[PDB]
Amino acid sequence: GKRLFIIKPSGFYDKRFLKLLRFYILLTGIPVAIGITLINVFIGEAELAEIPEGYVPEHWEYFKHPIS
């Protein structure tokens, strides 16, 4: 029958590689992904106008963002 044996050079090292990118990128990427998901749901910022801040204003944390 029509049959042979192909010759492919080297694939094991390239399959032993490409894991360690994709492994470790989820090891702290996906735990950081909830931090952009869960903190959106429960925490925001508001709003404008103004407030007058009492007498002395607030410190740093003048920003309008959860982690900033």
Partner 1 sequence: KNPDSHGYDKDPAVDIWNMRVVFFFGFSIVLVLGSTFVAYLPDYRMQEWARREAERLVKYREAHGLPIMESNCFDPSKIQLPED
Partner 2 sequence: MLKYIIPTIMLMPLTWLSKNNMIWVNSTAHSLLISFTSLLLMNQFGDNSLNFSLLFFSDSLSTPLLILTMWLLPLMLMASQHHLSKENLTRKKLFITMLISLQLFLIMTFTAMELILFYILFEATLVPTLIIITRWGNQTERLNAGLYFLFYTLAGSLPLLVALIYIQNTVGSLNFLMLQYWVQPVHNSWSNVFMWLACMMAFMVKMPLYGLHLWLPKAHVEAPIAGSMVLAAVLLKLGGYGMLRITLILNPMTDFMAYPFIMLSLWGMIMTSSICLRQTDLKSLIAYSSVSHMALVIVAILIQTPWSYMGATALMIAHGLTSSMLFCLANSNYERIHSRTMILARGLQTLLPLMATWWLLASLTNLALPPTINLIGELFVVMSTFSWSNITIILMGVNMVITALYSLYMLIMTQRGKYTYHINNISPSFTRENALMSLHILPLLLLTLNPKIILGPL
Partner 3 sequence: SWDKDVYPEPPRRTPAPSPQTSLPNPITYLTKAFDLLVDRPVTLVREFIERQHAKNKYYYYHREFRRVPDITECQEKDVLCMFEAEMQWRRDYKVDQEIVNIIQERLKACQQREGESHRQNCAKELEQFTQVVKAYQDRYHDLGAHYSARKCLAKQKQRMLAERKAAKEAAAA
Q: Which residues bind partner 3 (CB under 8 A)?
A: 41-46, 48-51, 53, 57-58, 61-64, 66
Nearer to partner 1, 12 or 55 (CB): 12
Q: Which of 20, 34, 46, 51 binds partner 1 (CB under 8 A)?
A: 20
| d(C-alpha 42, C-alpha 34), whole Å | 12
For residue 36, give Cα distances in angstroms to 32, 45, 55, 63, 65: 7, 15, 35, 17, 11
CA trace torsion 22, 27, 32, 34 (10° rounding):
100
The one of partner 2, partner 1, ligand CDL, none whose footprint includes residue 28, by CB under 5 to 8 A per kind, is partner 1
Nearer to partner 3, 12 or 62 (CB): 62
